Amino acid sequence: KPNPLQDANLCSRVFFWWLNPLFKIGHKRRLEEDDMYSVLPEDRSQHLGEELQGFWDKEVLRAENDAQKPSLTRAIIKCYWKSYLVLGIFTLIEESAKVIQPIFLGKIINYFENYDPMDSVALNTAYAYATVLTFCTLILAILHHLYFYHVQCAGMRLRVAMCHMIYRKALRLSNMAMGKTTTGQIVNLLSNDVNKFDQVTVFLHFLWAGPLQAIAVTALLWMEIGISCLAGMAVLIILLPLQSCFGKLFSSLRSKTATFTDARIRTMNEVITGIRIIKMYAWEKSFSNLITNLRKKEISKILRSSCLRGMNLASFFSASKIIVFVTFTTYVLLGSVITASRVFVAVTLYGAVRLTVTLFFPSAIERVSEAIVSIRRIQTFLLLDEISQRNRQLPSDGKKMVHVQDFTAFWDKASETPTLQGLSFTVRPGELLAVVGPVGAGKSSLLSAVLGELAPSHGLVSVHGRIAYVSQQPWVFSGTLRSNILFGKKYEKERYEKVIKACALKKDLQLLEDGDLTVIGDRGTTLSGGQKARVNLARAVYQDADIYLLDDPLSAVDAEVSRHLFELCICQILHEKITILVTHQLQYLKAASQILILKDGKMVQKGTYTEFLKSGIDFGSLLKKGFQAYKNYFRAGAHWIVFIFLILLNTAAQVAYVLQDWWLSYWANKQSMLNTEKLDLNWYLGIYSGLTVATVLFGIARSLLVFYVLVNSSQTLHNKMFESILKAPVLFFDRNPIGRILNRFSKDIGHLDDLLPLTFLDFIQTLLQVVGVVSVAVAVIPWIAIPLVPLGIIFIFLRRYFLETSRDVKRLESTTRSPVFSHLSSSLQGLWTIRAYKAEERCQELFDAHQDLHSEAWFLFLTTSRWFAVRLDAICAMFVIIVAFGSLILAKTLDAGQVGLALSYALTLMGMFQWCVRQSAEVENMMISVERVIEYTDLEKEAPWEYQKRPPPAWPHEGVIIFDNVNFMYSPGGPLVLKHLTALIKSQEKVGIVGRTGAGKSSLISALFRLSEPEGKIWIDKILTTEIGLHDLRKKMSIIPQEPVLFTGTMRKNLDPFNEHTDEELWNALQEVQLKETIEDLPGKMDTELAESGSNFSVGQRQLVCLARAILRKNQILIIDEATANVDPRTDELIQKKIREKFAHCTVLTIAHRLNTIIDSDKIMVLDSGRLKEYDEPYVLLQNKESLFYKMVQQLGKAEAAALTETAKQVYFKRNYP
């Protein structure tokens, strides 16, 4: 993939003409990783990594030689000054041009000030001055992008070298240091702390060009307007701390919202996750109240933050007006006079020096500080203790053999007992050494010591040969299965097929689409644990080293495949291979040529399996211990009257902005056309101050009103969302995952909270300033309207031709960035496996090949934006050239003031036009959040919570529940679930449910609570369920869910969220479940704040809490589901006895997985694959041997079935015959 940047001219690299081909492909189809362009030879990650590592090693060597701390900053400066000084040389020219061109503006205006149509020499000099002006703008517009590319490329280069060295160091970290750090702290300086280098360079040169330009402009101002300049200049300096006091008060109102936004998101997580429980309990009004309170206390801080942001942006808007106003007020008050040249040169000087002082220099300070902090972090990460490179091997005679003598070691220098105590044993080729020991013996530490991963404290380890190692936890990296097995080794067909067959991988390969070529991501998300272990064993076999270490390989696989692996691979293939095995299955010890027992870190005994049979020590003994979106976004915030007022306020602000400078123009014209006589100063200063004040107030009003309207618009959208999701049926929650629903209320809501109203108040600001500039240039020279139409239309087409490729390349630099982090993560978790093989240098090449794929999409993202900016500045330069020259070919009609106004505004169009375009792109990027928010504000809705026909208060009177021909389906068009359900439930009876998992046992609750409006009829005391709203049907039925959940809050709430009960009632209810005492030893009585799902509570305790809830509701209907999954037997029988003897007179339906729970129930649904077949007393069903109840009783066993039948008979005989 050749790069046209390498074969291009200078005239082609200034206009980025080498990039036209790609754009043409980008206009037709979508862009992939093949349409991409490769990188320069001087940009491959390996090259920069090697160079900067060389300089860093030299610097640390000199630090050792001179006994002071080494600094990475010095290495960076040493490696980059020779190539960073060039950029500085050019930015000096750029700032010099930005300071020079006002003077030639002044010379043109001065030619207009002394107009004489006959003096053609002055006309020619003015044409020359205009030509120099266009040269300045064409070196500020066309040569500033082949500069900005290289300024961003220096940062790209620095970051790529940094990432390469970080990975290189993290590949050889010592376990002493690797344990004190984490694997999240080794990705959080390669994903968030190495990105600063991509930005600091962009502004680095402004730490010396900022002040220099601020002195040059000040000197020019003094030369032209004199001491009064300081006055205005003073105001500009005031903008430096004032900008850093809207930041130490914005960051106190922005980090005081997280303590509310995160609370709101966490409550939303608990609401969305357990929505079945909330709906069944009919509690969602309580969570609605809680989220309303949190969202209101979050909108308060968002409203202060947005008001402050709006005031800051209006200060940015009106700062130039204030500077010019105070400057010329002082200039006139000290006794001088206004002419149209000194005014409109000083204006451009103030514009340039303001754009430098208030915008670029603080950003450079911030970014240099962030880059210095990041450099300090990467300094700390590169001084961690390394691993001793495997040193000079003692001269052997060619005998590949492992011998250990008197080995002692510690994982920590603080541990009292050493991990190993004087181990002195060896192994020879062909001898399958094995280790027997319970967990905690040190067998893993033993293999680590064999690998050298554990530092020897005493003794010696002699390992001479290639080492093949298998970790206890199988480790798979990002790649195909064949590549996973090869692990860099070249493929050999017969050597790859024997591995496959001996590892029994054929089944797994035939299960997947690509056979053995299926791509396996990180953590084995596409594989199973057995597959991971088998692929790791395949890697170990195919690497075919001299020495093999296997730590618990067969534990996680089935018996047959494990036996096959041990026999035909470990016993057969490795019978000629040095092998050390750690095992937990005793069956495989018979084939071990040796056995070592390790305990308390000490050798217990080595010998053959026969000798341990003779020792009398049984092993078990040892092993046991569009446009519509914008309209909907703007309609929500305010009615259209306020929107029309907003438009009028924008127009008034911009018009007053323009008219202040127009007033300076008019003042100059009225002064030149004079005569001693004077000019009435009070009037002129009065209207000039009035225009300045109008500009300031209208800017502030516009900013606050736009922020208020869009914040209100977001507040309304969020409220509509939330109150439209609390009413969505559970089917919607089944279709969409939690993450997608728990992200459109934290990510999407957060984008329209304090992101959307900024790029939308900035975009309007700069769009109206551009329109003001264009309208001034058209009102001064109307003929400009003719050429300016071929500069609108072209622009429009341009903005398409770019946005059909930028959006196709700002996803490539995102979908090819994650592989770097993925490989870094996958290489640290299997790091021992990587370093066990000598091929650690080969993973460096894989990292580079994953980094020469993101430094190849940052290339296109850095050059396509420049191909757009060159043409935008060509359009703006055509505009300024036409304004500067066409004001001279028409010199007979214009005057000094009009020319000054038009030409100075055309000069300030630069950069402003680009920022307008950039914010337009960002708004069109961030309206997707509004689109998603408005997609959820129009979701499905279940039947309303209230109906006209409210039920009688006594209902249910008894509990009679009649299922009449109930046909229920989870989703429309899906499989029938309950089909002609016809049953009767008489008050107070106990009806168990039997069936298969998913055969309709858990759908009766789904249909009886109308979680999905059923077809058929259900009568609760002769009242149709579908004829009453949900909260008059669910409030009168209690339930015990499968997995109890406690909602974050006081224990008062998880029982009485509506405050409808009193402390004595709650205490009594908790006493009935005997957990009363268990609570009155907590910090609070009931007001103990809890964790997620009551993490300080047990599953049985949670079931007790729900049982207490059911007791508190004291309604005459009740449903139990999955009583005790794996709860301890004491709590099991406790719950069971409470289920009977508290709820004797409360009609009970029970859906249980077992029989003892429901053996004594009065009756039983028998559900046959979604069909009710048998329903009577359990003893009657046991009388008929053909009943499914009889069959599933007998399936348990003989004694169990006999006891169950005896219990049923006892119940029958005690009940029906008194």
Ligand SMILES: CCCCC[C@H](O)/C=C/[C@@H]1[C@@H](C/C=C/CCCC(=O)O)[C@H]2CO[C@@H]1C2
């Ligand atoms: C994407 C290209 C942007 C061009 C930047 C241009 O040279 C800026 C000039 C001023 C802009 C302020 C820029 C903001 C700083 C950019 C830094 C950042 O966004 O991280 C807007 C306020 O008046 C004009 C437009």
